[PDB]
Amino acid sequence: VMTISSLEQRTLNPDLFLYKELVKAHLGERAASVIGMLVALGRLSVRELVEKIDGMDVDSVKTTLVSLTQLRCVKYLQETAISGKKTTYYYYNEEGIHILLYSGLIIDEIITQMRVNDEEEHKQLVAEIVQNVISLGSLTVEDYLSSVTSDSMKYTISSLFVQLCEMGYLIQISKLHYTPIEDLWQFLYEKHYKNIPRNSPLSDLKKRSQAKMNAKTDFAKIINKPNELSQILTVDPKTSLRIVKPTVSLTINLDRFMKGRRSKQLINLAKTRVGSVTAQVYKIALRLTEQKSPKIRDPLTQTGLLQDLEEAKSFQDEAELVEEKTPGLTFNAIDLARHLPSASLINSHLKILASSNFPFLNETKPGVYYVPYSKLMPVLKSSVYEYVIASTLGPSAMRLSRCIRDNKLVSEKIINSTALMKEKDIRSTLASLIRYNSVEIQEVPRTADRSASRAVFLFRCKETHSYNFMRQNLEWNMANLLFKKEKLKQENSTLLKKANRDDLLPSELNQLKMVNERELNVFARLSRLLSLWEVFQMA
Template sequence: MAPASLSESAKTQSPSSYLYTTLASSHLGETSAIVISSLIAFGRSTPKSISSNTDLSLKQVKTALVSLVQLKCVLYWREGKEVYYTFDERGMHRLLYSGDIVIHIRSVYGNDSAQIIQNVLENGSINVKEYLSSFSEDQKYETTSKLLKLYNDGWLSRLQPHDYYPLEDVWDMLFQETLKNTPRTATTSEIKRLAEAKARTKIKLNEYLAKGTDPKDVFLVEAGMQKFHPQVTVSFNLSRYEKHLRSRALVGLVNSRFGLLTSKVYEACCSLIEQNSPDLHLPHLQISGLINDPEEERSYISSIENGLIDSKRTVFNIRDIPRALSSNIDLRNSILTQNFLKPGKRVNINGTVSVSKKVKLEDGTPQPASAEADEDLDDDSDDFVTDNADAKSISLISEHIRLLTSSSIPMLSEITPGSYTIPYMQLSKHVKQHNLNTLVKTTLGVNALRVLRCIQQMKLVDEKAISNSVLLKEKTVKNELYKLINMNLVEIQEVPRSADRAAVKTFFLFRHKPISAYRFLSDALMYDMAEILTNIARFKSDNKILLEKCDREDVKGHEEELLLESELKTLRQLQQRELLNLGRLHRVMWLQIVFGVL
């Protein structure tokens, strides 16, 4: 029997399928990629059905499923004697972002903590007791403290059995239990009964997901030291990294609008409440059919955010910002306001400029100009107080905060005097819109951006109105509309003027739908990422013999002595090509995160 290979349909059925199967093929092998392709195409399946849908044997399928479940790329659910498997894209996100995750942890916590995170990502999870047993007694204390720090900061979470279960199956199980315990009565309609069961199940689901995360279930205290329970197993918390990505996107928006130093102040604000900020993927929104109304969805997200504000978990004080600022930040002379500038001419209360009068001294000689200036400066010293002595003074920080709160897009909201929060829900759409406008400007040109902004502002508009608004020729507007329509950023609506819908009497209106535009961009960027990964795999395959030769133990470290000049040249070209492609991959991946994840 010939070995199974990944079918062309894995690439063509959807951009996400193309990306995830390519990623799985490079990290986990072709068998795992085939299993993932089948689960994406056919949905919830048993091992037997996966085997029948592919050319894999049942043993190969089960072997691949073990590693995929371990990495949480596939979730399972048991019903009677059957076990059903479901693909989970968040497991693939852990593989996709793994390099960036390790780099970020290394920059914040150091090499040892980065090594812990890398081990967790490679194995899916680690048992704390077994992991510490591989260290000497001297190293155990340091490693335990680093594990505790990562756990308390939210980067690690306790592994629970329900982490391997599909959320929809968990919901269905809890809902059926609640419905059984909700009796039918003559005075209660079936609709009301279902609504009551649904409301109770939501509470049960939250309790079910929070089970086992209480500190007393995770930690114990021995000799005054906090330690993990021996049976605790930890895994990487992807939601925590997504919060970091959101903060990074918000800081980028502030940087483009206010400049570098204000963005550094805002970055410090984000770091103070990042861990407690709302999750990007809320459980109720991941269950299909639970929340269908957009208004109900906004209300649910808003209630989560307002609850965190009411409990002060996402509120920070301005006096906390200096300790969160980087040590190399100097805010002196960064604010140009009345309090931080050398005054010019004095202005009277009525708004007129006061004219300096010439004063004669007792001996009849005029007063020197320098003396007059010194007196004026002394008089003005109370009006113009400078606070440039401290590089991170509260007065300087408060001026930056005032910029952030009073702009057309408020990046901060003041709760009480001196206390602020970040309106994540409101800022989410502004981040995407800013990146979309930047993308249109750099790829399609300034005129295309003007036309797009006009359509965004006027909602539904015809070609002539666009031309009059943006002050461009009709021909130019037509060309820009053609580009935007090709990119699926603008939609066309046909408006017939006659009952027979005659083409001569028909005119067209244009509109921009942000959600569909972001979805299209996300899919296009996922396809580009898959193409880059395929390109890397292809040129590695073309030079497979040379790369296998370089991987031999007797060749490692002695390449210049044992390889031919032509082989060394090819090896350098391969390394440069891979670096260029990886750079492209990370740039495209960041845009996909903005439009598809945030």
């Protein structure tokens, strides 16, 4: 009745509307059009935009194009055909809107981890700098330096610039860094099948080894190019201190921002399982070793090509061995209570972090101890997931979830016995558990091929389907959240315009405090479930 229950919008926009919702708040109108269409139909051509919508031809497209490029909201690729001419195809770019869905959250960690400098002028300084970075979408150093006032300290803002290069965070602008992972692999795939001068028709399987191995080493140099390079940033001419290259520009990055929150999730699990001091001891390790830790960067070869059935492991364990290599080889030798803002050696507090392992924290090698980034994720997904059902439903829903996960695929016979207590309430919460997916249903017959009821039942599996249900939690929570926040704007729009011109009456101040209240609380709810989604996007 009256449809105000929002059943109208409920069915028809999975994923999708997420993107063009955000960019609408960003810009709106034409900007939401192109991207929203770039999503729905996927790969898109310049002329193709005009055909579909009748979008105010060639005035809007050329305007939106450069607008999307500066903030790099479009993945760009150009090639040709055997017939002739040229073609330029655009893709929905990485997650760049998610960064627009981040903003201050990134700047948060930027300010908080800028410590080792104690409560300085930095707070107002780089906050002005970083806000100028993301907003413009690209920043050249000299033109940025030109914006700084004269007859003052020029290297005060450059006191932290060469400190902006730091370890992670801001890196240089490079070339094809924005590029489809599938396409760059195919572009690098040339000169490999292209390589042989009619060599010899022996061992066809050697064409495999040739192309692959040569592509892998050529892939490593490309992906590690943005990762760590000290050429541009560490330039140090005389008559000065170390100063970043005035020519080469910079850009923000996925590296330590996606890592910092990943450590938080580890801390949240840590702090749960140990004391506050132990969480700190494990923290100081992660802060130093986060540089060489792939973690969030893990698959990196996954998108853009096949894995295998047979050779899947020969791919997978090839990654697992280099996931064995770098953490084992490179990472820190044993230190003693490094600095920090309990005397002697704190390794004893590590040993209590050692002896107690399951699920995680401190599995070791002889002579050197470090936490694996491979086997760690499964127990990380376990915990958070079980806490989700814990928060959602009562304590009954918890206990049964693992009851299916101890052994696997069994009937109600040993379940009723081994679970807890009562049949009818179990059947109740069985239907509540089986309500939305995640246990599926088992299909095996009884004394027939396929006939009817009384066939035996079992409960099992569905790890990825019990994952994706938290990916539905991604958009539709934030959706109505941000939407009815935006609807709160246009409703009070006549007031807000009056407030802006004023920057009177008893009741005009009332609705001023009203919206502002709702605003502050709706952003606190946004970042809340934002932190929840971020952990669920992997495995």
